[PDB]
Motif scaffolding. Structure first.
Motif, PDB file in Angstrom:
ATOM      1  N   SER A 175       6.237  -7.836  14.011  1.00 24.30           N
ATOM      2  CA  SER A 175       6.122  -6.919  12.834  1.00 24.30           C
ATOM      3  C   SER A 175       4.757  -7.185  12.127  1.00 24.30           C
ATOM      4  O   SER A 175       3.931  -7.974  12.630  1.00 24.30           O
ATOM      5  N   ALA A 176       4.509  -6.514  10.988  1.00 24.25           N
ATOM      6  CA  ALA A 176       3.255  -6.711  10.239  1.00 24.25           C
ATOM      7  C   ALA A 176       3.099  -8.149   9.761  1.00 24.25           C
ATOM      8  O   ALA A 176       2.000  -8.554   9.359  1.00 24.25           O
ATOM      9  N   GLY A 177       4.193  -8.912   9.805  1.00 25.77           N
ATOM     10  CA  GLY A 177       4.138 -10.306   9.358  1.00 25.77           C
ATOM     11  C   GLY A 177       3.133 -11.184  10.123  1.00 25.77           C
ATOM     12  O   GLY A 177       2.653 -12.174   9.566  1.00 25.77           O
ATOM     13  N   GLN A 178       2.838 -10.855  11.377  1.00 24.00           N
ATOM     14  CA  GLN A 178       1.861 -11.659  12.143  1.00 24.00           C
ATOM     15  C   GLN A 178       0.393 -11.366  11.752  1.00 24.00           C
ATOM     16  O   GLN A 178      -0.546 -12.013  12.297  1.00 24.00           O
ATOM     17  N   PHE A 179       0.173 -10.411  10.834  1.00 19.53           N
ATOM     18  CA  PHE A 179      -1.226 -10.120  10.365  1.00 19.53           C
ATOM     19  C   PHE A 179      -1.307 -10.329   8.840  1.00 19.53           C
ATOM     20  O   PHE A 179      -2.362 -10.074   8.209  1.00 19.53           O
ATOM     21  N   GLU A 180      -0.229 -10.858   8.246  1.00 22.79           N
ATOM     22  CA  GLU A 180      -0.221 -11.082   6.797  1.00 22.79           C
ATOM     23  C   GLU A 180      -1.337 -12.065   6.358  1.00 22.79           C
ATOM     24  O   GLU A 180      -2.152 -11.719   5.467  1.00 22.79           O
ATOM     25  N   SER A 181      -1.416 -13.243   6.987  1.00 16.48           N
ATOM     26  CA  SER A 181      -2.478 -14.206   6.638  1.00 16.48           C
ATOM     27  C   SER A 181      -3.881 -13.636   6.995  1.00 16.48           C
ATOM     28  O   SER A 181      -4.841 -13.852   6.241  1.00 16.48           O
ATOM     29  N   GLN A 182      -4.018 -12.930   8.132  1.00 19.87           N
ATOM     30  CA  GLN A 182      -5.360 -12.366   8.466  1.00 19.87           C
ATOM     31  C   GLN A 182      -5.780 -11.313   7.396  1.00 19.87           C
ATOM     32  O   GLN A 182      -6.969 -11.246   6.983  1.00 19.87           O
ATOM     33  N   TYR A 205      16.071 -15.315   0.016  1.00 20.74           N
ATOM     34  CA  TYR A 205      14.827 -15.601   0.774  1.00 20.74           C
ATOM     35  C   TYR A 205      13.861 -16.448  -0.074  1.00 20.74           C
ATOM     36  O   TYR A 205      13.626 -16.111  -1.242  1.00 20.74           O
ATOM     37  N   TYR A 206      13.308 -17.527   0.508  1.00 22.68           N
ATOM     38  CA  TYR A 206      12.370 -18.435  -0.183  1.00 22.68           C
ATOM     39  C   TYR A 206      11.047 -18.592   0.596  1.00 22.68           C
ATOM     40  O   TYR A 206      11.051 -18.548   1.837  1.00 22.68           O
ATOM     41  N   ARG A 207       9.921 -18.700  -0.116  1.00 21.13           N
ATOM     42  CA  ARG A 207       8.615 -18.953   0.514  1.00 21.13           C
ATOM     43  C   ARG A 207       7.647 -19.567  -0.540  1.00 21.13           C
ATOM     44  O   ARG A 207       8.014 -19.695  -1.720  1.00 21.13           O
ATOM     45  N   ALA A 208       6.420 -19.911  -0.125  1.00 19.61           N
ATOM     46  CA  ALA A 208       5.449 -20.510  -1.056  1.00 19.61           C
ATOM     47  C   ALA A 208       4.992 -19.414  -2.051  1.00 19.61           C
ATOM     48  O   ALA A 208       5.146 -18.203  -1.780  1.00 19.61           O
ATOM     49  N   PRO A 209       4.410 -19.819  -3.201  1.00 23.01           N
ATOM     50  CA  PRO A 209       3.957 -18.816  -4.182  1.00 23.01           C
ATOM     51  C   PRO A 209       2.815 -17.959  -3.633  1.00 23.01           C
ATOM     52  O   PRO A 209       2.118 -18.382  -2.675  1.00 23.01           O
ATOM     53  N   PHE A 210       2.662 -16.749  -4.185  1.00 27.59           N
ATOM     54  CA  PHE A 210       1.550 -15.844  -3.791  1.00 27.59           C
ATOM     55  C   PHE A 210       0.307 -16.288  -4.621  1.00 27.59           C
ATOM     56  O   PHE A 210       0.425 -16.464  -5.839  1.00 27.59           O
ATOM     57  N   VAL A 211      -0.857 -16.481  -3.980  1.00 27.04           N
ATOM     58  CA  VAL A 211      -2.097 -16.888  -4.681  1.00 27.04           C
ATOM     59  C   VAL A 211      -3.107 -15.761  -4.787  1.00 27.04           C
ATOM     60  O   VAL A 211      -4.126 -15.900  -5.498  1.00 27.04           O
ATOM     61  N   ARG A 212      -2.858 -14.658  -4.068  1.00 21.86           N
ATOM     62  CA  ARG A 212      -3.717 -13.479  -4.162  1.00 21.86           C
ATOM     63  C   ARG A 212      -2.850 -12.250  -3.772  1.00 21.86           C
ATOM     64  O   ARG A 212      -1.706 -12.421  -3.321  1.00 21.86           O
ATOM     65  N   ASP A 213      -3.344 -11.027  -3.970  1.00 19.77           N
ATOM     66  CA  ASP A 213      -2.569  -9.836  -3.597  1.00 19.77           C
ATOM     67  C   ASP A 213      -2.126  -9.923  -2.117  1.00 19.77           C
ATOM     68  O   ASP A 213      -2.905 -10.385  -1.265  1.00 19.77           O
ATOM     69  N   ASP A 214      -0.929  -9.415  -1.821  1.00 18.29           N
ATOM     70  CA  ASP A 214      -0.348  -9.461  -0.444  1.00 18.29           C
ATOM     71  C   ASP A 214       0.297  -8.101  -0.183  1.00 18.29           C
ATOM     72  O   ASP A 214       1.355  -7.768  -0.746  1.00 18.29           O
ATOM     73  N   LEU A 215      -0.335  -7.303   0.658  1.00 17.55           N
ATOM     74  CA  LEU A 215       0.185  -5.953   0.917  1.00 17.55           C
ATOM     75  C   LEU A 215       0.954  -5.838   2.243  1.00 17.55           C
ATOM     76  O   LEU A 215       1.254  -4.728   2.683  1.00 17.55           O
ATOM     77  N   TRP A 216       1.331  -6.979   2.829  1.00 18.45           N
ATOM     78  CA  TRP A 216       1.946  -7.027   4.185  1.00 18.45           C
ATOM     79  C   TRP A 216       3.199  -7.922   4.291  1.00 18.45           C
ATOM     80  O   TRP A 216       3.532  -8.394   5.398  1.00 18.45           O
TER      81      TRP A 216
END
Ligand SMILES: CCCCCCCCCCCCCCCC
Ligand SMILES: [Ca+2]
Length: 456
Positions: free
Chosen positions: A15-22, A296-307
């Motif tokens: 899914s789009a999740g594999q390009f979230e960090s890129q 659902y749990y994850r690390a905090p967002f440090v910048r905008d995330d559109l994915w």
């Protein structure tokens, strides 16, 4: 700025999740975040109807082996009755619309295309289908997928390959080549890791822009708030899921800091919300027609995330029902059940080329063992619960039902449903990440924790 839009196409069960960090790395180097787009599609029907060759002739993996075992023999017949020329035409016309909208929004004349695994087969057929479609492509990047074929005529192409042992390396070893393309190799990387790595990002950015990026880090932006665009969708088939979302800010032990949720909404697939930079959050979701409560749990967002992506289990590939016998036992009111996710293979078996092993502790017990997470299983999703609902943690007896699921494994560990659960990861590439959350009971609750795919 003086950049062109980029569009990413995922592989089987992706899914789009594999390009979230890129996407966050491109934006940290000057791209308007909205210039990075993703195209999602149903990979079960695409593999069975269009890529039957790859599926039962190694070009691909071992899903073929586990198709008759997973999908209902009738459902499979309905899927196989679909017309191939029709599926190809309708899906390609949808990608056309995503490309045309990116060009109108940016003013550019061409876009850059990136594919991973099965997505590389998809894109070579798409660019080869008509002169009109290829005329709108500036560069094509193929990540750890197809080999032994010609790069499309007249389009600059880059192919990047990872460690062969990584998965069924029964084929070509360390020597995969796309004809007429620039080919390079990263022999220290596994399959999904290659798609999300900061080293792969530096290589793609230089290929399409002509210079080395100033940074490969996920740089926190200034300001108190971040914009988040995400979607709740079905695993593998990727259709929109409907339900109710409650977001709560939480403390270091996972306790909710507010009486009411800070955001409450009815979701139908995609959603958009403004949140606080650096703050830990719990995303609680209830999906239509199920009484189970998901956290659902994850690390905090440090910048905008559109994915951002939140995976949900649905027919015809309802992987979550594999756990139903235990959820229905009286013991379920006494223990927790969790799923741990990382888009970078969790490896418990030592290997030189790869050069390291990961450690994953739940209430102090390491569940990333040589037996539960061997290199060949390429584990991105790890299920942790009391197999058999017998009150016994038998870690050395494998949980057989998951041996047939791609990219997944499971560990038989009793996690008491009282107080909190401690979770910690020590990465094979260095560094560590930890979480403390409430120990929700399995009879009425499901827990999903997503680890970051790169720690600096
Ligand atoms: C190449 C991409 C591999 C992705 C592996 C994902 C593993 C997790 C599967 C989650 C299935 C749905 C869980 C729903 C919540 C219980
Ligand atoms: Ca057990």
């Amino acid at each position: 700025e003086d950049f062109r839009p980029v569009v990413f196409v995922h592989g089987l069960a992706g899914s789009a999740g594999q390009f979230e960090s890129q996407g966050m790395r491109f934006a940290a180097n000057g791209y308007p975040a909205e210039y990075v787009k993703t195209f999602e599609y149903d990979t079960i029907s695409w593999a069975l109807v269009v890529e039957t060759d790859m599926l039962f002739s190694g070009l691909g993996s071992e899903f073929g082996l586990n198709i008759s075992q997973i999908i209902d023999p009738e459902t499979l017949d309905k899927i196989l009755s679909k017309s191939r020329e029709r599926l190809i035409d309708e899906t390609f016309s949808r990608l056309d619309r995503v490309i045309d909208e990116a060009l109108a929004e940016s003013g550019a004349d061409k876009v850059d295309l990136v594919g991973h695994a099965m997505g590389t087969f998809f894109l070579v057929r798409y660019v080869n289908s008509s002169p009109e479609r290829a005329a709108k492509v500036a560069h094509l990047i193929l990540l750890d997928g197809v080999w032994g074929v010609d790069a499309p005529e007249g389009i600059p192409t880059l192919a990047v390959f990872g460690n062969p042992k990584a998965l069924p390396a029964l084929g070509l070893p360390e020597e995969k080549v796309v004809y007429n393309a620039t080919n390079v190799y990263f022999n220290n990387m596994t399959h999904v890791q290659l798609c999300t790595s900061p080293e792969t990002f530096a290589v793609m950015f230089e290929f399409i822009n002509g210079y080395k990026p100033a940074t490969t880090d996920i740089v926190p932006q200034d300001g108190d708030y971040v914009k988040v665009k995400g979607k709740f969708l079905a695993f593998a088939t990727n259709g929109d899921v409907s339900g109710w979302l409650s977001i709560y800010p939480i403390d270091e032990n996972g306790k909710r800091l507010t009486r009411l949720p800070v955001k409450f909404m009815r979701v139908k697939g995609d959603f958009e919300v403004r949140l606080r930079k650096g703050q830990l959050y719990e995303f609680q979701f209830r999906k239509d027609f199920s009484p189970i409560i998901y956290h659902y749990y994850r690390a905090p967002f440090v910048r905008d995330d559109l994915w951002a992506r939140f995976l949900v289990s649905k027919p015809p590939l309802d992987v979550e029902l594999l756990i139903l016998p235990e959820r229905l036992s009286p013991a379920a009111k006494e223990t927790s059940g969790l799923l741990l996710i990382r888009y970078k293979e969790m490896i418990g078996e030592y290997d030189e080329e790869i050069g390291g092993v990961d450690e994953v502790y739940v209430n102090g017990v390491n569940v990333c063992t040589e037996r539960i997470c061997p290199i060949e299983r390429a584990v991105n999703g790890l299920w942790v619960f009391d197999r058999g609902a017998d009150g016994k943690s038998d870690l050395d007896r494998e949980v057989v039902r998951y041996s047939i699921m791609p990219f997944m494994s499971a560990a038989d560990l009793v996690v008491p449903a009282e107080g909190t659960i401690s979770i910690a990861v020590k990465s094979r590439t260095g560094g560590e990440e930890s979480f403390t959350i409430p120990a929700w009971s399995a009879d009425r609750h499901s827990i999903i924790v997503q680890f970051s795919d790169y720690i600096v």
